[PDB]
Amino acid sequence: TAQLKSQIQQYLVESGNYELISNELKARLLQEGWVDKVKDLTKSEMNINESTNFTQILSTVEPKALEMVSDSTRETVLKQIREFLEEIVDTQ
Amino acid sequence: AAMSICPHIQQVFQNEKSKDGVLKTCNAARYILNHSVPKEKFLNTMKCGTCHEINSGATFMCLQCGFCGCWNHSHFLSHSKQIGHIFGINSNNGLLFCFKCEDYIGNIDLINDAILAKYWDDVCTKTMVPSMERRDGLSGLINMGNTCFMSSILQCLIHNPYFIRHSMSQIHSNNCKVRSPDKCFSCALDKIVHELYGALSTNRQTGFIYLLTCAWKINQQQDAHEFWQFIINQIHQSYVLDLPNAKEVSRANNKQCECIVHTVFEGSLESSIVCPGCQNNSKTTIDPFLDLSLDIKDKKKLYECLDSFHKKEQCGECNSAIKQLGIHKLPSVLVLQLKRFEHLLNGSNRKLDDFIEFPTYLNMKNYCSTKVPDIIYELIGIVSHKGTVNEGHYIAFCKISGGQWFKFNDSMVSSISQEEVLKEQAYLLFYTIRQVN
Amino acid sequence: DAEIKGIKPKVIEEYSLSQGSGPSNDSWKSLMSSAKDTPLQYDHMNRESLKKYFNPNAQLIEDPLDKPIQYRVCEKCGKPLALTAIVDHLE
Amino acid sequence: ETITIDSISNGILNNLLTTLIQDIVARETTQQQLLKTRYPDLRSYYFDPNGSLDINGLQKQQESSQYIHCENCGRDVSANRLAAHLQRCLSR
Ligand SMILES: [Zn+2]
Ligand SMILES: [Zn+2]
Ligand SMILES: [Zn+2]
Ligand SMILES: [Zn+2]
Ligand SMILES: [Zn+2]
Ligand SMILES: [Zn+2]
Ligand SMILES: [Zn+2]
Ligand SMILES: [Zn+2]
């Protein structure tokens, strides 16, 4: 069906590979300054909307923070995820 | 205009047995999150019980049952509606969400400070929240005169998370055998912390005057780096004096010290000799450090200065070799001196004023002896020198939570953007461990 | 790119990936025995890399600038107190 | 409609990224909610693009017109002389 995703994640976790991907992504985002950019954006958005309500603030921040990920980080980590999936999935 | 509290948890807390149940469960959830290995943590706290996805946004751990549910497909929200359990703990950060308010509960001290639940009446009556003005410890130190080599260093210590935790934990205070801030350096440093963060013509200079008084009693030069070394040695000496069994601990461990200095700032360098033929590491010598002094001549970047510090120098049959310096053990806080002051043989002094670019996050993997994983430090402090080796002036810049930088120029404390901070001529850099893969 | 047929059967078997996709019966509260057995863990400071590259007695604060310093001020003497030092001080 | 290595890889990355954003934003919003509840009259630290005024919006004080009372000798001492003064005074 479409529990493919959840079964692939289970494999990635159990094999040790999810940890690798997760840490690699975090190390890259941190070093390129994206973590601190998202924190700035968040503060700025709280000021703008005069609110600390999480649901409201997230709806303005998340779309922008997704787009702020550098091309290099995004396409490197996607390639690294594909390569792990190439080992375990059949295609047609 | 007044900010309000989640009305739902307030209602729950009208019953004291319920309040205690909530606080027990919050403590339990947080404990588990700090005591689960990464795989367990993914499979058991970050896996949605409805869709079974890992990290479908935040995953929340229910207060009232064992269910975990995701954000992105609104599965915890469905649980709160279906079953009536409206509270869950985010398994990334331990924060408590009200799914009726659609917000976190972040402004109740009891829940934030839940580990003291059993003592909360005593805590509440006998302590208060920091005052607005002192909450970040920001205050200037007057130049009293040619004392900016001391005050610049003190601002970096006072804004260092490890020292501030040490001091506020009362560890020195509980054990000190002198108990007087005009004699004990460590007691003087505690007094400065007291003044800057708590409550004890000019203001908030008392602890600093005490320290000068202590300094004198040892006895009174020019160099902020030398005062850094002086002051960390005093903190160590005071730990050793306060032990019951200093002789014995040294014999047993010897050359391991458990003081705040030696468990935070100390690493070690490995000096090695290696056969070019086969790469047999024949011979290593390990030596401790409290900071790394780097040559900057003809360089533009901090990573070039480290590359130079780390460079290779000068089977059948291993001794007829190459020498290399690398890091054997890293410290929790890495401190870097960029060597800028020359003292020539004719008694004259020269200042190297070269700009050296230094990063907000520093990866030390390429400098550790040995594949080395990413080991990434966050820049939190800079001391800058301006002018001549002897007739010059030190300023400190410290980063606090949220990422604002502050400039400390004697009594003047000002806000400064990161862009401007990164253009400073760094003399000392203070880096704190942030991520280890 | 290429369309997925499925997870390799061998991988399904090795890793026991077949899971009846009704709601889970797990409880996070069941983790407590294992958690009590387990030494303090960091979210992103790998325990095995810490043993290799840092001192065994290192003090470690994960994400020390995550939030402002968490303290309260003694009403008697005005000292700033770490949360874990308050009870002892009040004596 | 059509499930590929690339679409699943992108789903995996989006899980990692939205989680991390949702974490950062939650930490920001709770902290600010606390500060604003704790201090209803909270002010930002003053920022001066021209680099003249301090965090309270004030000019640098002239440190040589200030004095400190020396507890060793009971005199007022000009603040910028205190360290020289102490050399002479503590020796007494
Ligand atoms: Zn779900
Ligand atoms: Zn529930
Ligand atoms: Zn609520
Ligand atoms: Zn003392
Ligand atoms: Zn020591
Ligand atoms: Zn050889
Ligand atoms: Zn007290
Ligand atoms: Zn005097």
XYZ file of C-alpha atoms and ligand atoms in Angstrom:
720
model
C 0.000 0.000 0.000
C 1.635 3.289 1.161
C 3.254 2.093 4.410
C 6.363 1.839 2.219
C 7.554 5.073 3.773
C 7.213 3.910 7.362
C 8.864 0.500 6.582
C 11.794 2.195 4.800
C 12.252 4.482 7.874
C 12.184 1.486 10.164
C 14.930 -0.130 8.094
C 16.954 3.139 8.131
C 16.683 3.362 11.887
C 17.428 -0.250 12.650
C 20.420 -0.392 10.300
C 22.033 2.659 11.956
C 21.657 4.755 8.814
C 18.913 7.132 9.946
C 21.209 8.390 12.703
C 23.912 9.017 10.095
C 21.581 10.964 7.865
C 20.032 12.920 10.683
C 23.407 13.954 12.157
C 24.875 14.772 8.751
C 21.940 17.057 7.972
C 22.096 18.745 11.359
C 25.922 19.298 11.079
C 25.472 20.873 7.618
C 22.552 23.110 8.614
C 24.331 24.274 11.705
C 27.594 25.105 9.910
C 25.950 26.993 7.027
C 24.107 29.145 9.645
C 20.585 27.924 8.891
C 19.812 26.976 12.520
C 20.466 30.543 13.674
C 18.644 32.006 10.685
C 15.550 30.001 11.642
C 15.780 31.251 15.198
C 16.024 34.902 13.909
C 13.129 34.386 11.537
C 11.113 33.033 14.431
C 11.768 35.981 16.683
C 11.022 38.332 13.875
C 7.769 36.599 13.144
C 6.706 36.750 16.817
C 7.268 40.559 16.736
C 5.450 40.913 13.443
C 2.275 39.015 14.478
C 2.525 40.053 18.148
C 2.115 36.503 19.211
C 3.963 33.622 20.847
C 1.205 31.104 19.836
C 3.112 28.103 18.438
C 0.542 27.060 15.819
C 0.271 30.553 14.395
C 4.035 31.229 14.439
C 4.933 27.838 12.872
C 2.555 28.411 9.936
C 4.537 31.563 8.988
C 8.054 30.242 9.772
C 8.073 26.635 8.412
C 7.473 27.400 4.734
C 10.228 30.032 4.757
C 12.684 27.867 6.737
C 12.201 24.990 4.244
C 13.174 27.367 1.388
C 16.192 28.718 3.290
C 17.954 25.311 3.168
C 20.901 25.720 0.817
C 20.904 23.905 -2.507
C 24.165 22.158 -1.590
C 22.788 20.749 1.710
C 19.461 19.803 0.205
C 20.857 17.972 -2.839
C 23.778 16.353 -0.904
C 21.508 14.889 1.769
C 18.909 13.809 -0.814
C 21.643 11.947 -2.735
C 22.826 10.276 0.481
C 19.226 9.144 1.315
C 18.697 7.812 -2.342
C 21.850 5.803 -2.153
C 20.711 4.023 1.003
C 17.276 3.399 -0.586
C 18.901 2.014 -3.846
C 20.278 -0.828 -1.672
C 16.840 -1.941 -0.400
C 14.142 -1.167 -2.997
C 13.295 -2.836 -6.318
C 12.256 -0.556 -9.165
C 10.482 -1.246 -12.448
C -2.152 43.499 27.257
C -1.286 40.823 29.949
C -0.026 37.363 28.839
C -2.176 34.543 30.158
C -1.711 30.960 31.269
C -3.215 27.865 29.710
C -6.572 27.652 31.511
C -6.724 23.847 31.148
C -3.577 22.957 33.024
C -4.576 25.606 35.662
C -7.863 23.745 36.205
C -6.018 20.403 36.437
C -3.673 21.986 39.022
C -6.594 22.896 41.339
C -6.363 19.285 42.461
C -3.048 18.646 44.241
C -2.992 14.898 43.504
C -3.562 15.682 39.806
C -0.858 18.391 39.872
C 1.578 15.879 41.332
C 0.589 13.260 38.713
C 1.268 15.703 35.870
C 4.670 16.705 37.337
C 5.657 13.059 37.892
C 4.810 12.177 34.316
C 6.610 15.245 32.872
C 9.717 14.287 34.873
C 9.405 10.693 33.713
C 9.068 11.651 30.060
C 12.104 13.986 30.266
C 14.165 11.366 32.033
C 13.449 8.840 29.378
C 14.377 11.330 26.621
C 17.772 11.949 28.322
C 18.424 8.226 28.968
C 17.517 6.537 25.664
C 20.121 5.615 23.052
C 19.462 7.151 19.606
C 17.733 4.061 18.042
C 15.365 3.578 20.977
C 14.639 7.222 21.031
C 13.628 7.167 17.281
C 11.575 3.933 17.548
C 9.940 4.581 20.874
C 9.434 8.333 21.166
C 9.526 9.625 17.571
C 7.343 7.011 15.855
C 3.680 7.913 15.392
C 1.326 5.262 16.828
C -1.254 5.965 14.036
C 0.860 6.282 10.798
C 4.071 4.615 12.171
C 6.275 7.282 10.503
C 9.447 8.453 12.185
C 9.743 12.235 12.630
C 6.369 13.152 10.954
C 7.070 16.520 12.406
C 7.296 16.634 16.174
C 6.073 13.492 17.928
C 4.230 13.966 21.212
C 4.227 11.600 24.181
C 0.751 11.575 25.851
C 0.559 12.623 29.544
C -2.335 10.296 30.251
C -1.501 7.107 28.302
C 1.445 5.559 26.440
C 0.463 6.784 23.005
C 2.844 8.820 20.796
C 1.383 10.870 17.906
C 2.747 13.056 15.076
C 2.213 16.646 14.185
C 2.316 16.590 10.411
C -0.737 14.306 9.895
C -2.371 15.750 13.019
C -2.392 12.412 14.738
C -1.926 13.575 18.271
C -4.639 16.171 17.750
C -6.998 13.303 16.705
C -5.984 11.453 19.918
C -6.834 14.437 22.065
C -10.288 14.676 20.362
C -11.110 10.979 20.240
C -9.816 10.057 23.760
C -9.895 13.505 25.575
C -6.097 13.622 26.361
C -5.191 17.153 25.545
C -1.531 17.259 26.864
C 1.558 15.814 25.190
C 5.374 16.162 25.505
C 7.426 16.905 22.404
C 10.080 14.166 22.275
C 12.734 16.516 20.732
C 12.750 19.007 23.595
C 10.592 17.848 26.571
C 8.151 20.816 26.185
C 4.486 20.392 27.135
C 1.816 21.181 24.484
C -1.889 21.920 25.157
C -3.800 20.662 22.151
C -6.903 22.785 23.146
C -4.879 26.019 23.272
C -2.858 24.820 20.260
C 0.167 26.203 22.047
C 2.993 25.120 24.342
C 2.749 25.749 28.020
C 6.024 27.666 28.470
C 5.301 30.179 31.202
C 4.658 28.112 34.341
C 7.867 27.940 36.459
C 6.789 24.746 38.211
C 6.522 22.793 34.940
C 9.828 24.313 33.573
C 11.542 23.534 36.926
C 9.691 20.277 37.409
C 12.658 18.483 38.973
C 12.023 20.619 42.140
C 8.268 19.780 42.315
C 8.670 18.156 45.691
C 10.262 21.349 47.086
C 8.240 23.887 45.213
C 6.634 25.777 48.153
C 10.032 26.286 49.780
C 11.621 27.271 46.454
C 8.796 29.751 45.706
C 8.848 31.494 49.064
C 12.582 31.670 49.405
C 13.762 32.549 45.958
C 12.568 34.853 43.227
C 12.997 34.993 39.409
C 15.921 37.032 38.166
C 15.301 40.761 37.774
C 14.846 41.967 34.253
C 18.058 44.006 34.295
C 20.370 41.292 35.723
C 18.888 38.237 33.974
C 21.640 38.103 31.282
C 24.509 39.190 33.547
C 25.282 42.219 31.410
C 27.290 44.944 33.134
C 30.487 46.809 32.451
C 33.782 46.905 34.356
C 35.449 50.280 34.777
C 39.042 50.595 33.611
C 40.867 51.186 36.901
C 43.527 51.698 34.944
C 45.425 49.519 32.487
C 42.997 46.803 33.759
C 41.213 46.027 30.468
C 43.543 43.008 30.055
C 41.788 41.633 33.075
C 38.238 42.818 32.520
C 38.053 41.588 28.915
C 38.946 38.056 30.131
C 36.500 38.273 33.038
C 33.621 39.136 30.683
C 34.358 35.969 28.700
C 34.504 33.855 31.891
C 31.262 35.343 33.295
C 29.535 34.590 30.016
C 30.968 31.085 29.755
C 28.135 28.480 30.372
C 30.423 26.069 32.239
C 31.830 28.661 34.609
C 28.464 30.243 35.228
C 26.927 26.814 36.038
C 29.894 26.100 38.351
C 29.611 29.357 40.201
C 25.790 29.323 40.504
C 25.953 25.690 41.717
C 27.752 26.985 44.878
C 30.503 24.339 44.540
C 33.361 26.648 45.559
C 31.329 28.406 48.170
C 30.327 25.123 49.881
C 33.983 23.957 50.161
C 36.194 27.047 50.424
C 38.618 27.068 53.373
C 39.322 30.853 53.178
C 35.786 32.266 52.667
C 36.852 35.820 51.970
C 36.729 37.672 48.644
C 39.737 39.944 49.485
C 41.939 36.786 49.831
C 40.471 34.043 47.722
C 40.425 34.596 43.897
C 37.593 32.104 43.523
C 35.548 33.905 46.195
C 36.119 37.206 44.284
C 34.881 35.596 41.020
C 31.754 34.320 42.832
C 31.140 37.848 44.039
C 31.255 39.219 40.483
C 28.721 36.578 39.436
C 26.582 37.544 42.391
C 26.737 41.178 41.433
C 26.050 40.696 37.727
C 23.250 38.106 37.894
C 21.774 38.601 41.418
C 21.788 41.329 44.060
C 24.637 42.215 46.476
C 30.100 57.197 41.621
C 29.740 53.650 40.188
C 27.783 50.302 40.307
C 28.625 46.588 40.291
C 32.396 47.044 40.671
C 32.788 45.424 44.105
C 33.711 41.950 43.050
C 36.207 43.315 40.539
C 37.830 45.490 43.231
C 38.056 42.372 45.395
C 39.793 40.516 42.588
C 42.336 43.334 42.207
C 42.862 43.129 45.928
C 43.491 39.321 45.670
C 45.796 39.886 42.678
C 47.844 42.295 44.592
C 48.227 39.942 47.536
C 49.930 37.372 45.165
C 51.460 40.241 43.369
C 50.085 42.525 40.666
C 51.503 42.433 33.318
C 50.234 43.551 30.004
C 48.860 40.455 28.233
C 45.281 39.234 28.358
C 46.462 35.732 27.482
C 48.734 35.672 30.510
C 45.946 36.792 32.779
C 43.646 34.001 31.341
C 46.372 31.519 32.327
C 46.784 33.177 35.714
C 43.188 33.103 36.582
C 42.524 29.474 35.522
C 45.553 28.372 37.506
C 44.101 30.153 40.604
C 40.750 28.408 40.193
C 42.677 25.060 40.042
C 44.862 25.906 43.079
C 41.821 26.658 45.109
C 40.219 23.333 44.270
C 43.404 21.501 45.334
C 43.551 23.502 48.641
C 39.920 22.595 49.404
C 40.424 18.807 48.962
C 40.757 16.690 52.171
C 43.367 14.416 50.527
C 45.207 16.341 47.769
C 48.357 14.158 48.076
C 46.350 10.960 47.840
C 44.141 11.959 44.845
C 47.257 12.929 42.901
C 49.074 9.698 43.697
C 45.946 7.654 42.588
C 45.043 9.510 39.343
C 48.086 11.537 39.006
C 47.799 14.123 36.229
C 44.003 13.794 36.262
C 42.316 16.660 38.071
C 38.584 16.977 38.556
C 38.443 20.740 38.944
C 36.216 22.924 36.755
C 39.309 24.090 34.834
C 40.674 20.666 34.051
C 37.285 19.086 33.200
C 36.305 21.940 30.784
C 39.352 23.619 29.203
C 41.934 20.832 29.126
C 42.761 18.804 26.053
C 45.931 17.046 24.907
C 48.222 17.151 21.917
C 49.920 14.116 20.437
C 53.389 14.663 19.064
C 54.214 11.681 16.822
C 56.993 10.162 14.697
C 55.909 8.082 11.667
C 57.729 5.830 9.142
C 57.199 7.165 5.567
C 57.732 3.601 4.262
C 54.767 1.885 5.980
C 53.104 4.569 8.201
C 54.058 2.684 11.431
C 53.461 5.246 14.191
C 56.667 4.397 16.083
C 56.573 6.898 18.891
C 54.014 9.326 20.407
C 54.252 11.822 23.291
C 50.985 13.132 24.856
C 51.046 16.634 26.436
C 48.118 18.528 27.955
C 46.953 21.996 26.905
C 44.617 24.603 28.292
C 44.600 26.688 25.056
C 46.217 26.460 21.598
C 48.558 29.243 20.460
C 48.539 29.675 16.766
C 50.970 31.472 14.380
C 49.147 33.865 12.037
C 52.022 35.195 9.924
C 51.101 35.366 6.245
C 47.766 33.668 6.801
C 44.204 34.865 6.241
C 41.986 32.270 7.866
C 41.750 30.437 11.120
C 41.635 27.025 9.354
C 44.998 27.920 7.619
C 46.502 28.625 11.055
C 45.296 25.253 12.318
C 46.576 23.546 9.095
C 50.010 25.012 9.766
C 49.911 23.912 13.426
C 49.038 20.389 12.177
C 51.485 20.063 9.229
C 53.899 17.143 8.723
C 57.547 18.097 9.321
C 61.121 17.085 8.352
C 58.888 -2.753 7.466
C 62.439 -1.662 6.415
C 63.335 -0.368 8.884
C 61.188 2.207 10.780
C 64.316 3.888 12.199
C 66.939 4.572 9.497
C 60.931 9.666 9.818
C 58.171 12.363 9.849
C 57.071 14.441 12.849
C 53.457 15.692 13.299
C 51.507 17.557 15.987
C 47.797 16.656 16.337
C 45.021 16.698 18.870
C 44.680 13.576 21.003
C 41.878 14.841 23.220
C 39.622 17.882 22.680
C 38.314 20.102 25.478
C 34.660 21.036 26.139
C 35.744 24.674 25.636
C 38.475 25.213 23.136
C 40.424 28.446 23.581
C 42.622 29.809 20.797
C 45.319 32.500 21.069
C 46.328 34.106 17.773
C 49.865 35.213 18.486
C 50.098 38.920 17.753
C 52.772 40.350 20.050
C 56.448 40.040 19.099
C 59.224 40.854 21.493
C 62.391 41.371 19.599
C 65.939 40.724 20.845
C 66.678 44.442 20.929
C 63.881 45.046 23.495
C 61.455 46.483 20.985
C 57.877 45.155 20.645
C 55.806 44.723 17.442
C 52.058 44.082 17.008
C 50.770 41.918 14.168
C 47.561 43.558 13.066
C 46.600 40.993 10.304
C 42.905 40.217 9.983
C 42.256 36.489 10.409
C 38.827 35.218 9.397
C 37.270 33.004 12.040
C 34.005 31.053 11.709
C 30.847 31.146 13.862
C 31.050 27.302 13.886
C 34.405 25.519 13.869
C 34.950 21.900 12.777
C 37.968 20.350 14.445
C 37.825 16.953 12.700
C 40.820 17.553 10.343
C 43.155 18.280 13.339
C 42.507 15.219 15.514
C 45.086 12.445 15.339
C 43.998 9.145 13.754
C 37.808 8.602 9.669
C 37.236 11.448 12.200
C 33.595 12.481 12.424
C 32.327 16.127 12.454
C 33.237 17.738 15.784
C 31.743 21.205 15.695
C 32.222 24.039 18.193
C 30.181 27.240 18.520
C 31.996 30.589 18.852
C 30.863 32.343 22.018
C 33.615 34.783 22.914
C 36.287 37.008 21.414
C 38.930 39.266 22.983
C 40.285 41.883 20.613
C 43.387 44.104 21.105
C 43.742 47.558 19.502
C 47.020 49.601 19.408
C 50.579 48.949 20.508
C 51.876 45.919 22.444
C 52.129 47.996 25.637
C 49.972 51.140 24.974
C 46.901 49.278 23.678
C 43.356 48.446 24.718
C 41.364 45.133 25.040
C 37.669 44.726 24.274
C 35.535 41.567 24.724
C 32.619 40.380 22.644
C 30.346 37.630 24.019
C 27.435 35.744 22.469
C 24.525 34.891 24.690
C 21.399 32.772 24.174
C 19.330 33.714 21.122
C 22.434 34.745 19.313
C 22.846 38.406 20.238
C 26.386 39.550 20.601
C 27.473 42.169 23.068
C 30.567 44.407 23.075
C 32.213 45.140 26.481
C 34.372 48.228 26.288
C 35.238 48.991 29.885
C 32.020 50.300 31.476
C 30.144 50.415 28.185
C 28.080 47.387 27.141
C 26.578 47.652 23.644
C 24.735 45.364 21.141
C 26.644 44.515 17.977
C 25.560 42.487 14.933
C 27.257 39.251 14.137
C 28.459 40.765 10.793
C 30.406 43.426 12.677
C 31.746 40.992 15.294
C 33.178 38.740 12.550
C 35.264 41.667 11.251
C 37.180 42.061 14.510
C 40.879 41.428 14.834
C 40.671 38.451 17.131
C 43.324 37.869 19.772
C 41.570 35.172 21.869
C 38.674 33.007 20.658
C 36.370 30.959 22.970
C 34.605 27.986 21.305
C 32.178 25.665 23.105
C 31.404 22.071 21.976
C 28.043 21.998 20.105
C 27.840 18.819 17.976
C 29.835 15.570 17.877
C 28.891 13.024 15.213
C 12.925 8.767 -11.659
C 12.261 4.940 -11.702
C 9.066 3.784 -10.022
C 9.255 1.608 -6.915
C 8.033 -1.963 -7.087
C 8.602 -2.736 -3.399
C 11.204 -3.224 -0.657
C 13.489 -6.197 -1.429
C 11.875 -9.283 0.171
C 15.133 -10.219 1.793
C 15.227 -6.808 3.539
C 11.612 -7.195 4.646
C 12.581 -10.508 6.251
C 15.917 -9.606 7.750
C 14.508 -6.517 9.430
C 10.948 -7.850 10.185
C 9.366 -4.882 8.394
C 5.845 -6.500 8.013
C 3.777 -4.601 10.569
C -0.052 -4.770 10.782
C -0.828 -1.091 10.101
C -3.668 -0.787 12.626
C -2.953 1.556 15.580
C 0.135 0.681 17.691
C -0.190 -0.911 21.180
C 3.147 0.566 22.391
C 3.579 2.654 25.451
C 6.382 5.226 25.989
C 5.854 4.633 29.712
C 7.280 1.113 29.206
C 10.728 2.638 28.431
C 11.404 3.473 32.049
C 13.356 0.337 33.128
C 15.683 0.623 30.173
C 16.041 4.386 30.685
C 17.089 3.844 34.396
C 19.739 1.326 33.212
C 21.143 3.727 30.643
C 23.787 6.398 31.227
C 23.000 10.004 30.308
C 22.684 10.399 26.523
C 23.019 13.542 24.334
C 20.816 14.268 21.353
C 23.736 15.111 19.098
C 26.962 14.337 20.896
C 27.646 10.730 19.988
C 28.639 8.684 23.057
C 31.275 6.581 21.263
C 32.907 9.651 19.644
C 32.915 11.374 23.074
C 34.877 8.377 24.550
C 37.376 8.523 21.666
C 37.962 12.259 21.268
C 37.182 13.814 24.664
C 38.316 13.173 28.222
C 36.311 10.556 30.161
C 35.671 13.103 32.949
C 34.746 16.035 30.598
C 31.931 18.283 31.695
C 29.373 18.560 28.905
C 26.464 20.911 28.374
C 24.551 20.219 25.245
C 23.409 23.328 23.369
C 24.568 25.652 26.206
C 23.165 28.765 24.443
C 19.819 27.115 23.734
C 18.188 29.260 26.396
C 19.176 31.843 28.932
C 20.742 30.745 32.141
C 18.086 29.019 34.346
C 18.434 30.378 37.896
C 16.596 31.933 40.858
C 17.815 34.555 43.345
C 17.925 33.976 47.100
C 15.672 36.489 48.854
C 17.934 36.580 51.989
C 21.403 37.095 50.452
C 20.540 37.888 46.801
C 22.817 35.072 45.439
C 22.009 33.606 42.045
C 21.289 29.947 42.395
C 21.283 27.108 39.893
C 18.050 25.112 40.086
C 19.891 22.020 41.504
C 21.505 24.210 44.265
C 18.386 25.954 45.673
C 17.185 23.306 48.208
C 20.666 22.904 49.748
C 21.147 26.683 50.006
C 17.864 27.216 51.836
C 19.484 25.979 55.169
C 0.515 9.780 -7.711
C 3.617 7.750 -8.631
C 6.001 6.608 -5.897
C 9.759 6.727 -6.793
C 13.106 6.584 -4.996
C 13.202 10.338 -5.418
C 9.727 11.027 -3.989
C 10.328 8.806 -0.953
C 13.757 10.402 -0.425
C 12.131 13.785 -0.503
C 9.431 12.585 1.978
C 12.262 11.415 4.320
C 14.062 14.758 4.082
C 10.844 16.624 4.658
C 10.260 14.566 7.822
C 13.728 15.443 9.087
C 13.459 19.126 8.176
C 9.906 19.889 9.503
C 10.799 18.091 12.748
C 13.866 20.198 13.251
C 12.037 23.438 12.379
C 9.165 22.486 14.694
C 11.755 21.919 17.502
C 13.537 25.259 16.979
C 10.258 27.190 16.790
C 8.882 25.524 19.965
C 12.023 26.461 21.861
C 11.746 30.073 20.665
C 8.054 30.528 21.336
C 8.146 28.982 24.864
C 11.117 31.102 25.837
C 9.478 34.324 24.641
C 6.163 33.411 26.285
C 8.136 33.016 29.539
C 10.021 36.324 29.196
C 6.820 38.255 28.344
C 4.864 36.680 31.267
C 7.716 37.194 33.684
C 8.350 40.801 32.616
C 5.176 42.500 31.221
C 7.199 45.700 30.732
C 10.124 43.962 28.932
C 12.256 46.224 26.647
C 14.698 45.172 23.936
C 18.343 45.997 24.542
C 19.058 49.193 22.666
C 20.867 48.836 19.289
C 22.735 51.814 17.813
C 23.860 51.378 14.181
C 26.261 54.287 14.721
C 28.019 52.494 17.604
C 27.669 55.246 20.213
C 24.964 54.326 22.667
C 24.900 51.393 25.101
C 22.241 48.771 25.768
C 20.149 51.260 27.762
C 20.448 53.934 25.038
C 23.035 55.955 26.953
C 26.375 57.531 26.055
C 29.670 56.321 27.508
C 30.274 57.806 30.927
C 33.620 59.632 31.485
C 35.218 57.168 33.870
C 37.686 59.781 35.235
C 34.858 61.896 36.704
C 33.706 58.910 38.781
C 35.130 57.891 42.112
C 35.132 54.801 44.322
C 35.407 54.744 48.086
C 38.486 52.768 49.148
C 37.623 50.595 52.102
C 41.302 50.192 53.086
C 42.017 53.880 53.739
C 38.510 55.440 53.755
C 39.208 57.918 50.878
C 37.414 58.589 47.669
C 39.682 57.678 44.749
C 39.145 58.592 41.138
C 37.910 55.347 39.520
C 40.532 55.316 36.751
C 43.241 55.400 39.473
C 42.012 52.693 41.731
C 44.532 49.991 40.616
C 47.516 52.363 41.091
C 45.987 53.516 44.354
C 45.652 49.989 45.668
C 49.416 49.275 44.936
C 50.269 52.097 47.279
C 47.438 51.746 49.742
C 47.357 47.978 50.475
C 51.137 48.044 51.036
C 50.378 50.765 53.660
Zn 1.123 10.098 12.388
Zn -3.375 9.469 25.572
Zn -4.646 24.910 27.210
Zn 37.074 30.975 48.130
Zn 42.489 21.276 38.282
Zn 58.118 1.270 8.372
Zn 20.878 33.075 50.376
Zn 42.985 53.323 49.803
